[PDB]
Design a protein around this ligand. Structure first.
Ligand SMILES: NC(=O)c1ccc[n+]([C@@H]2O[C@H](COP(=O)([O-])OP(=O)(O)OC[C@H]3O[C@@H](n4cnc5c(N)ncnc54)[C@H](O)[C@@H]3O)[C@@H](O)[C@H]2O)c1
Ligand SMILES: NC(=O)c1ccc[n+]([C@@H]2O[C@H](COP(=O)([O-])OP(=O)(O)OC[C@H]3O[C@@H](n4cnc5c(N)ncnc54)[C@H](O)[C@@H]3O)[C@@H](O)[C@H]2O)c1
Lengths: 340, 337
């Protein structure tokens, strides 16, 4: 490995999925850690074999600029802190890997891209599904016209949000989160509908409801259903939920056949099947090594901040629709650089 | 088989699913046939062993009143003709088995129930899913609280509608159909959401879209998506499609687990699974029989068929207006789901 990563935020996703993910990389390596807790970091640094000399925090973060071995930083902090460290990261002349959602604002999304252009460094959002062989296979068979003309997409993404003092979970603060289940996980359905169909929604409608007596959803929504229409005439209906167990299910209906992905966006072995009348590339690794190679070849990354912005913007539209009860035009010429 | 059935409409569903369905019954029997074609009726009567002496048509239909071995009639004609023969059937003092949708109007749905009460005969709608062991099993495990508190239901029901001169498919003609994919098959999703959740939607929202250049959907809709909310706070989002292949898929999300029915409402072996012996057709036929043989109300009454029709109307209204539609009108499924 010759591409150094600086992991910012040693939380659940970092510790459980990302750090272990490095094991399969073939270019990436954990060069430095960052966290508001040295004790934790220490144990971590040891654990993954990183010299404790590279354990920073949110104060001396900018210090990374003086370490050329640190090719890039990987933000894995609450959504609101995304833009802050993304820019500071670019200011230190380093490529950025930012987790989804890109940010809690469309503005910050644009700002981040700016900073990136400035520092002349790459900005990649954590859409691991864009590096999951299973999803890529689904996409392949759809493009090979095995479903025929696509007409109805259906998505659902849910998981029970811990009730343990909602004041604790940053996902339940509109400030740190930016939204409820949609921002957190529905985004997988939204994002998937787009790359599965290979096009953008031109119109959007939605509705949301959260129990008024549930302490968890005082700031962020629990359940929200959205419906979209595309230029090709394809349609979709999806939802995200914070009060029902694990659900990761996508269905794509064509005139020839129907595709079923269940689980669709899970951490381990996703399943896809077709109804007609992962060789050395787990998502995590492939995601990390994808930013590396992009740099090592000046080639554009598959999941740019422009894509992360498109989702955030759509997510706003969807929330707007749910708020007004009216459809919302989203036909603003966005275009997937590189494809889906 | 002491219950005599008079099959009205020897079409695809009658010939392919219903007639053969009798083979498994244990009370029902094919006593008479009815159809605007005695030639076929003949071949059919022979085929299933019915004396050609009982082959009627839409003119001498009422004649059935003079045959006491004829306990009931089974309407299997286009949706618009449902109410007409349902009432005439009751007028001849005979229990009625009417296929879904009950009718193309809420009024006719009420009228049919009236006629039924009058003739003091029973009225049962063809919701075979209410007699499918697989569905009943799904319902059982939900009631046993294996999913926990229900929060998100998802349904999809689709099948490609033949393009062969749409002036040929009574389903593509508003008057005979009453609606598009919703009336025809979405109804399974709507109906299933209700008996799976064991409650009624109090609010409804929907949207529909059909290609303006497709000859098929000039009168009836191709695809329509509807979202509903229930009293328990549960939610649902479903759709029906006339332009995409076979899809019969239901998912029910609880806080404990998730139920997946796929296929959910098929003719043969449906599948259900949870993530943390008999057959609908026969059981449906024998269900009307026994109900009579015991002065016991049937599980799928015309009141239930009306509720769906009324809901479908509110869903079409919503799709038309683009605003939510209140459906909290106190309906109640006597007996249960
Ligand atoms: N792509 C995926 O599969 C996936 C899955 C899980 C999480 N995520 C994303 O990664 C990010 C982190 O999620 P997570 O589950 O690891 O969260 P977490 O709460 O477990 O981790 C948060 C990290 O940021 C730090 N932090 C900084 N300020 C904080 C504050 N104000 N309050 C609480 N935490 C604070 C914590 O110390 C910790 O290191 C989010 O943007 C989330 O949406 C993506
Ligand atoms: N529960 C189920 O599984 C299921 C499945 C299929 C059909 N159905 C229902 O059963 C009924 C019949 O459907 P089908 O597929 O058998 O239809 P079909 O067109 O194959 O059969 C229609 C029958 O009614 C007669 N008919 C009377 N007037 C007609 C007219 N004006 N034009 C065309 N047909 C006319 C035909 O001769 C034929 O015997 C419908 O109400 C349908 O919704 C239910």
């Amino acid at each position: 490995r010759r591409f150094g990563y600086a992991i910012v935020g040693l939380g659940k996703y970092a510790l459980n999925q990302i750090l272990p993910g490095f094991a399969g990389c073939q270019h990436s390596r954990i060069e430095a850690l960052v966290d508001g807790n040295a004790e934790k970091a220490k144990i971590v640094a040891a654990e993954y074999g990183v010299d404790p000399r590279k354990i920073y925090d949110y104060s001396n973060f900018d210090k990374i600029a003086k370490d050329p071995k640190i090719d890039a930083v990987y933000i894995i902090l609450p959504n609101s802190l995304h833009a802050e460290f993304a820019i500071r990261a670019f200011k230190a002349g380093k490529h950025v890997m930012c987790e989804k959602p890109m940010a809690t604002s469309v503005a910050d999304c644009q700002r981040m891209i700016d900073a990136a252009k400035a520092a002349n460094k790459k900005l990649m959002i954590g859409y691991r599904c864009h590096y999951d062989p299973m999803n890529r296979a689904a996409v392949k068979l759809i493009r090979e016209n095995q479903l025929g003309k696509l007409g109805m997409v259906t998505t659902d993404n849910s998981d029970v949000m811990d009730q343990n003092d909602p004041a604790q979970q940053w996902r339940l603060r509109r400030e740190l989160a930016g939204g409820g289940s949609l921002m957190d996980i529905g985004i997988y359905g939204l994002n998937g509908t787009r790359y599965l169909l290979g096009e953008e929604p031109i119109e959007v409608r939605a509705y949301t409801y959260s129990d008024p007596n549930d302490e968890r959803f005082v700031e962020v929504e629990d359940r929200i259903i959205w419906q979209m229409r595309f230029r090709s005439g394809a349609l979709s209906h999806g939802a995200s939920s914070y009060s029902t167990t694990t659900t990761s299910r996508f269905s794509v209906q064509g005139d020839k056949a129907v595709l079923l992905m269940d689980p669709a966006t899970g951490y381990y072995q996703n399943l896809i099947s077709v109804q007609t009348p992962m060789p050395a590339n787990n998502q995590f690794s492939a995601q990390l090594d994808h930013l590396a190679e992009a740099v090592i070849n000046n080639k554009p990354v598959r999941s740019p901040g422009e894509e992360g912005m498109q989702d955030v913007r759509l997510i706003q539209a969807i929330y707007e629709a749910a708020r007004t009860g009216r459809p919302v035009n989203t036909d603003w010429g966005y275009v997937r650089q590189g494809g889906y």
